[PDB]
Design an enzyme around this catalytic site. Structure first.
Site, PDB file in Angstrom:
ATOM      1  N   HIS A 122       1.012  -1.029  -0.150  1.00 55.26           N
ATOM      2  CA  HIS A 122       0.154   0.077  -0.053  1.00 55.26           C
ATOM      3  C   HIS A 122       0.916   1.154  -0.119  1.00 55.26           C
ATOM      4  O   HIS A 122       1.728   1.553   0.865  1.00 55.26           O
ATOM      5  CB  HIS A 122      -0.939  -0.127   1.150  1.00 55.26           C
ATOM      6  CG  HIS A 122      -1.922   0.967   0.982  1.00 55.26           C
ATOM      7  ND1 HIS A 122      -3.155   1.072   0.155  1.00 55.26           N
ATOM      8  CD2 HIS A 122      -2.433   1.821   2.012  1.00 55.26           C
ATOM      9  CE1 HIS A 122      -3.958   2.152   0.306  1.00 55.26           C
ATOM     10  NE2 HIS A 122      -3.569   2.710   1.617  1.00 55.26           N
ATOM     11  N   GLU A 158       2.899  10.427  -3.754  1.00 56.41           N
ATOM     12  CA  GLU A 158       3.348  10.083  -2.404  1.00 56.41           C
ATOM     13  C   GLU A 158       4.780  11.018  -2.206  1.00 56.41           C
ATOM     14  O   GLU A 158       5.074  11.535  -0.970  1.00 56.41           O
ATOM     15  CB  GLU A 158       3.749   8.907  -2.469  1.00 56.41           C
ATOM     16  CG  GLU A 158       2.705   7.961  -2.565  1.00 56.41           C
ATOM     17  CD  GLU A 158       1.683   7.983  -1.638  1.00 56.41           C
ATOM     18  OE1 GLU A 158       0.527   7.568  -1.849  1.00 56.41           O
ATOM     19  OE2 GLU A 158       2.150   8.165  -0.421  1.00 56.41           O
ATOM     20  N   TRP A 163     -32.459   9.881   7.505  1.00 61.23           N
ATOM     21  CA  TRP A 163     -31.388   9.282   6.443  1.00 61.23           C
ATOM     22  C   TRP A 163     -31.761   9.443   5.064  1.00 61.23           C
ATOM     23  O   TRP A 163     -31.341   9.845   4.159  1.00 61.23           O
ATOM     24  CB  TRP A 163     -30.817   8.026   6.868  1.00 61.23           C
ATOM     25  CG  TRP A 163     -29.859   7.360   5.871  1.00 61.23           C
ATOM     26  CD1 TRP A 163     -30.000   6.300   5.140  1.00 61.23           C
ATOM     27  CD2 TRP A 163     -28.276   7.764   5.893  1.00 61.23           C
ATOM     28  NE1 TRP A 163     -28.811   6.226   4.340  1.00 61.23           N
ATOM     29  CE2 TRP A 163     -27.840   7.036   4.829  1.00 61.23           C
ATOM     30  CE3 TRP A 163     -27.784   8.701   6.521  1.00 61.23           C
ATOM     31  CZ2 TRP A 163     -26.568   7.239   4.455  1.00 61.23           C
ATOM     32  CZ3 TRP A 163     -26.360   8.736   5.972  1.00 61.23           C
ATOM     33  CH2 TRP A 163     -25.609   8.069   4.977  1.00 61.23           C
ATOM     34  N   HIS A 183     -16.154   4.313   7.296  1.00 59.07           N
ATOM     35  CA  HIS A 183     -15.731   5.396   8.206  1.00 59.07           C
ATOM     36  C   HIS A 183     -16.711   5.559   9.378  1.00 59.07           C
ATOM     37  O   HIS A 183     -16.595   6.329  10.141  1.00 59.07           O
ATOM     38  CB  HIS A 183     -15.673   6.613   7.396  1.00 59.07           C
ATOM     39  CG  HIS A 183     -14.755   6.501   6.135  1.00 59.07           C
ATOM     40  ND1 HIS A 183     -13.598   7.320   6.086  1.00 59.07           N
ATOM     41  CD2 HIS A 183     -14.626   5.813   5.135  1.00 59.07           C
ATOM     42  CE1 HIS A 183     -12.853   6.969   4.942  1.00 59.07           C
ATOM     43  NE2 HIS A 183     -13.487   5.976   4.330  1.00 59.07           N
TER      44      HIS A 183
END
Ligand SMILES: *[C@@H]1O[C@H](CO)[C@@H](O[C@@H]2O[C@H](CO)[C@@H](O)[C@H](O)[C@H]2NC(C)=O)[C@H](O)[C@H]1NC(C)=O
Ligand SMILES: *[C@@H]1O[C@H](CO)[C@@H](O[C@@H]2O[C@H](CO)[C@@H](O)[C@H](O)[C@H]2NC(C)=O)[C@H](O)[C@H]1NC(C)=O
Ligand SMILES: *[C@@H]1O[C@H](CO)[C@@H](O[C@@H]2O[C@H](CO)[C@@H](O)[C@H](O)[C@H]2NC(C)=O)[C@H](O)[C@H]1NC(C)=O
Ligand SMILES: *[C@@H]1O[C@H](CO)[C@@H](O[C@@H]2O[C@H](CO)[C@@H](O)[C@H](O)[C@H]2NC(C)=O)[C@H](O)[C@H]1NC(C)=O
Ligand SMILES: *[C@@H]1O[C@H](CO)[C@@H](O[C@@H]2O[C@H](CO)[C@@H](O)[C@H](O)[C@H]2NC(C)=O)[C@H](O)[C@H]1NC(C)=O
Ligand code: NAG
Lengths: 98, 597
Positions: B327, B357, B459, B487
């Site tokens: 990763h 990165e 919702w 999450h």
């Protein structure tokens, strides 16, 4: 001067009451007192051991790696003939006004 | 002595011990991540526990310096970062129960299985198979099955746990004077006592709601275009004036519309730029990619890589047997030790991930002189925006044909530019209503404006009204559709993905004016310009030293987040969509549902 796992044999002081004077050496290990309370020789709250230490490792960046320093300092007090540098003389000739 | 010189002397010792211990822990973590064995898992856990114990002890020691007598704002920033109790303000029973339900919820999400109605011995996890059905399938019934079963078998397990998690988290947050858990989360954007750069916690809601009101005219045209394009893949299943069924959007939740590109491509006979055969034909390896990335970064006036980056990093997958989490991550072990861990192939997406990165690596290299606690982005949205503008700039045809990967002439057309802008809109624009609506629901739930017997009602009302998607099956108060996302069941905030998307285009437009670009914004390349590099470095080097409203100003010129740069980026696609929806109906009605017939 660097070992994997840490070379904990190089110390340095980071707590002191006052700045050092030129060419002065201080090797005492008394407990620095930051507050207003005495601590009488034991670390804790507001009393720190004054000597830290570099944990040198080979996987550090330049700027955190060990550097060996040598400082030469010269002295001219009053002596007539002292330590001086090397010269190289000349060959001696003969039978000529020289 | 007072009380401000003692806090500084405490912070010094803390900095020195903390830096040492953090380096040890990070080295252990790296040694594990790059070489998975069994003894590494414990050699890393010991260092982790040592670090956490040190942090806890110093945090309870830092309380003895009252934050009212500190006048320096750097010392105050560090002390306030160190004094926060976080958890551990609860009882022992309550803390144990909270950690228990957290682990239970994470385990239910990670190992939940759903299987076939006609073959009950064919059970599929989410990761290998459910979000592979939801990404690739074109069957209405199979997508409906995968959508309904995941929320009816695993989502219904998370409801009694989430109901208790809410209570325990609110109890934790109110003991830290925060009014609820959502306010605790919004406390990341707060600034106090800078006299011109202040920022409240309730101001974030107002800012988010005022910036979302301007994205609606673009999202409405994108929604109408995608709807008219989906009415051909699934005829007699979508209404031309209604919302979109939630199980046809591209993945399990509809977070990104990026998998609808094969269905909604504007000009499908024009393949867009993909320089992967030229890399393979020019004999590129994993080191040439990172050399090109480093060259791009040194072009704008930024430093080289630290020479410990080339020896210690793992830039390719280790062959024989060296099981490693492949990763891409940028590591910041401290003490001048910067590394990148990624297993690169020879493709184009890896060519862009390299720049992404190395952007993080450059940001970490910048603020390496700040104190230990002030080494991070200005807030949670800065680091990834700084990393994302790099891959934005490195993927343009102007940059690619100056490297040698595109033919030296390569005349561009506007059809491929529309293709590219639409492919970008499905990922960037399609996720902002989702993010806004999700975080709004969570805020209102933590605050107490939605009682626990109206969670699913609100919702789905909000999903019909803000996002514009309708459920294919009704859902009563035994479900928990929020908790079926990673999450939500794993206790992560979600508003960083909304502010990062705005900071990204603010930064890109700010840096495209220093490079004196002339064309449309999506064609900008900031390479070979040292003014953009200096504008960026003036912010990269601050860390958390100054308020984020100040660090933002150092690049953009404004103090608050703005949405006009994003619409500027997407203007040509906006005009094209506006002309493609001449006979369509822009908008949706909150009454049509796929079952009410
Ligand atoms: C990956 O980790 C394993 C276990 O931690 C290492 O395996 C042994 O490591 C010791 C360490 O000195 C060596 O003396 C042995 O010879 C290793 N045995 C084998 C079978 O490899 C392994 O060396 C590590 N790999 C790397 C690249 O560091
Ligand atoms: C306390 O605040 C002062 C300024 O309000 C800080 O002074 C700065 O110190 C750094 C390095 O210590 C210098 O590079 C800056 O130029 C100084 N600024 C000014 C305006 O003189 C001081 O550092 C703060 N205290 C601590 C412990 O950081
Ligand atoms: C952090 O938690 C502590 C208790 O766990 C809070 O309570 C104070 O702790 C200090 C240090 O022992 C005492 O001197 C005070 O008397 C305690 N009560 C107070 C200040 O009302 C502490 O307030 C918490 N701190 C923060 C910043 O949340
Ligand atoms: C950045 O500027 C350099 C310097 O001009 C560019 O490199 C030159 O590009 C021209 C145009 O193709 C070539 O003729 C030269 O041979 C190149 N010189 C070197 C040393 O590479 C470079 O292309 C520019 N980069 C970008 C992205 O525009
Ligand atoms: C791409 O550009 C071409 C040429 O600039 C456009 O083609 C013209 O479009 C206008 C607008 O309807 C027509 O009036 C012209 O007749 C077109 N040219 C020809 C030769 O037929 C094209 O529309 C543009 N495409 C996009 C998607 O913007
Ligand atoms: C970067 O490294 C190269 C060697 O590959 C060197 O020639 C160049 O001067 C360096 N640039 C900077 C800014 O350090």
């Amino acid at each position: 001067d660097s070992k994997v796992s840490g070379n904990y044999n190089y110390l340095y002081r980071l707590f002191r009451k006052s700045k050092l004077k030129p060419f002065e050496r201080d090797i005492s290990t008394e407990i620095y007192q930051a507050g207003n309370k005495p601590c009488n020789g034991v670390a804790g709250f507001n009393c720190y051991f004054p000597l830290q230490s570099y944990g040198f490792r080979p996987t550090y960046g330049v700027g955190h790696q060990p550097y060996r320093v040598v400082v030469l300092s010269f002295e001219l007090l009053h002596a007539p003939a002292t330590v001086c540098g090397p010269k190289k003389s000349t060959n001696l000739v003969k039978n000529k006004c020289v | 002595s007072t009380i401000e010189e003692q806090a500084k002397t405490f912070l010094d010792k803390f900095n020195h011990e903390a830096e040492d211990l953090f380096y040890q822990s990070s080295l252990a973590s790296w040694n594990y991540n790059t070489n998975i064995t069994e003894e590494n898992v414990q050699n890393m856990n010991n260092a982790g526990d040592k670090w956490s114990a040190f942090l806890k002890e110093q945090s309870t020691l830092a309380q003895m310096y009252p934050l009212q007598e500190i006048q320096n704002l750097t010392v105050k920033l560090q002390l306030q970062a160190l004094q926060q109790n976080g958890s551990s303000v609860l009882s022992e029973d309550k803390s144990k129960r909270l950690n228990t339900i957290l682990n239970t919820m994470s385990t239910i999400y990670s190992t939940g299985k759903v299987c076939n109605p006609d073959n009950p011995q064919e059970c599929l996890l989410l990761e290998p198979g459910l979000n592979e059905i939801m990404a690739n399938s074109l069957d209405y019934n199979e997508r409906l099955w995968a959508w309904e079963s995941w929320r009816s078998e695993v989502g219904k397990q998370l409801r009694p746990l989430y109901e208790e998690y809410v209570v325990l988290k609110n109890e934790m947050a109110r003991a830290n004077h925060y009014e609820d858990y959502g306010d605790y989360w919004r406390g990341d954007y707060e600034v106090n006592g800078v006299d011109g750069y202040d920022y409240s916690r309730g101001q974030l809601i107002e800012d988010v709601e005022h910036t979302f009101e301007e994205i609606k005219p673009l999202y409405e045209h994108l929604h109408a275009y995608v709807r008219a394009k989906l009415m051909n893949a699934y005829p007699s299943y979508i209404s031309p004036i209604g919302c979109l069924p939630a199980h046809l959007l591209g993945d399990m939740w509809g977070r990104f519309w990026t998998n609808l590109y094969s269905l909604t491509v504007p000009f499908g006979q024009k393949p867009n730029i993909d320089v992967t055969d030229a890399m393979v034909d020019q004999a590129w390896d994993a080191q040439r990619i990172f050399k090109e990335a480093e060259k791009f970064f040194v072009s704008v006036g930024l430093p080289n890589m630290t020479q410990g980056f080339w020896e210690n990093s793992m830039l390719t997958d280790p062959g024989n047997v060296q099981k490693a989490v492949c990763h891409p991550t940028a590591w910041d072990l401290g003490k001048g030790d910067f590394r990148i861990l990624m297993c690169t192939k020879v493709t184009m997406d890896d060519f862009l991930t390299a720049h992404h990165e190395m952007g993080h690596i450059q940001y970490d290299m910048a603020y390496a002189a700040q104190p230990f606690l002030l080494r991070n982005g200005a807030n949670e949205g800065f680091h990834e925006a700084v990393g994302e503008i790099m891959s934005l700039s490195a993927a343009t045809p102007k940059h690619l044909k100056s490297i040698g990967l595109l033919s030296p002439d390569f005349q561009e057309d506007n059809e491929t530019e529309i293709n590219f802008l639409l492919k970008q809109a499905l990922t960037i624009v399609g996720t902002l209503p989702f993010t806004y609506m999700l975080e709004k629901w969570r805020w209102m739930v933590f605050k107490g404006e939605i009682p626990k017997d109206q969670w699913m009602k609100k919702w789905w009302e909000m999903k019909r009204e803000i996002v514009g998607v309708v459920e294919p099956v009704p859902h009563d108060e035994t479900y928990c559709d929020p908790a079926s996302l990673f999450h939500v069941s794993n206790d992560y905030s979600f508003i960083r993905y909304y502010t990062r998307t705005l900071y990204q285009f603010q930064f890109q437009e700010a840096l495209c004016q220093a490079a004196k670009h002339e064309g449309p914004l999506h064609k900008c390349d900031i390479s070979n310009s040292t003014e953009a590099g200096q504008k960026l470095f003036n912010m990269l080097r601050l860390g958390k030293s100054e308020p984020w409203t100040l660090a933002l100003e150092n690049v953009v010129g404004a103090k608050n987040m703005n949405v006009r740069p994003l619409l500027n980026y997407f203007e040509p696609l906006f005009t094209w969509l506006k002309d493609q929806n001449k006979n369509s109906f822009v908008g949706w009605s909150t009454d049509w549902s796929p079952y009410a017939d």
